[PDB]
Amino acid sequence: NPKWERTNLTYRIRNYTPQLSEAEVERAIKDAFELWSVASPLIFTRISQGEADINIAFYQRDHGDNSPFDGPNGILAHAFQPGQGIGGDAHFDAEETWTNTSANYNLFLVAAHEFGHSLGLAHSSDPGALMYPNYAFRETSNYSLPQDDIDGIQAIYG
Ligand SMILES: CC(C)C[C@H](C(=O)NO)C(=O)N[C@@H](CC(N)=O)C(=O)NCc1cccc(N)c1
Ligand SMILES: [Ca+2]
Ligand SMILES: [Ca+2]
Ligand SMILES: [Zn+2]
Ligand SMILES: [Zn+2]
């Protein structure tokens, strides 16, 4: 069970997707972290430059870590479990159409899903869970964490 042994974690958005404004990309990311924050003792702080615990980046195909993206659709992103260096970092497929809407692919929902991995959760077999393996759009305004995921972070931290 890899877990962060620190509660206030920093993050850094190294690059952006042209698809959305910078504000929208940052709001997506911010709200995705809040989701996990309200069900745990974790506190997230954004840094504009520097070494952050969780780096966030939009990459294309081969991007230096031995797990290349695959073009439109398919693999949308991946994250590494808690740890130093690459640990907890999250990568998003730059070749996807990233949206703020119901249209594939909603950046807030994918980000929320990746941050679960970054915090130490694995995929869930519960189809109503965020950590379920396949993407599904769900209303995002006033979105809250499904109960299975709450059970998930709570079991790791408090
Ligand atoms: C190596 C890939 C096969 C797995 C990868 C994964 O689950 N990363 O977290 C992934 O991108 N899975 C896709 C599977 C798919 N295209 O349906 C995905 O949508 N993952 C993210 C996801 C899943 C569930 C909910 C939400 N919001 C997002
Ligand atoms: Ca892809
Ligand atoms: Ca890291
Ligand atoms: Zn990667
Ligand atoms: Zn996943």
- The residue whose CA has the least distance to atom 15 of ligand 1 is 134
Site to probe by mutation for ligand 1, drawn from 130, 134, 148 as the one with most ligand atoms within 8 Å of Cβ, is 134
Look up the domain containing 46 and give its range: 1-158
**How far apart are the CA of 133 and the centre of ligand 5, in A?**
6
- The residue whose CA has the least distance to atom 16 of ligand 1 is 74
Q: Is 91 in the pocket of ligand 1 (CB under 6 A)?
A: no
Q: Which burial class, exposed, middle or buried, applies to 26 when counting CB atoms under 10 A from its CB (0-12, 13-18, 19+)?
A: middle
This structure was determined by X-ray
Catalytic residue among 22, 34, 95, 114: 114
Q: Is 109 in the pocket of ligand 1 (CB under 6 A)?
A: yes
- Number of structural domains found in the chain: 1
Q: Is 122 in the pocket of ligand 1 (CB under 6 A)?
A: no
Q: Is 95 a catalytic residue?
A: no
Say which CATH number the domain at 85 has: 3.40.390.10
Tokens (6 digits) for 22 = 């910078």
CA 131 vs CA 16, 22, 118, 126, 144: distances in Å: 24, 26, 12, 8, 13
Q: Which residues contact 10 (CB under 8 A, 6 or more apart)?
A: 44, 45, 46, 47, 52, 53, 54
Q: Which burial class, exposed, middle or buried, applies to 130 when counting CB atoms under 10 A from its CB (0-12, 13-18, 19+)?
A: buried
Resolution attained, angstroms: 2.0
| Cα three-residue angle 86-78-10, rounded to 5 degrees | 50
Q: Which burial class, exposed, middle or buried, applies to 158 when counting CB atoms under 10 A from its CB (0-12, 13-18, 19+)?
A: exposed
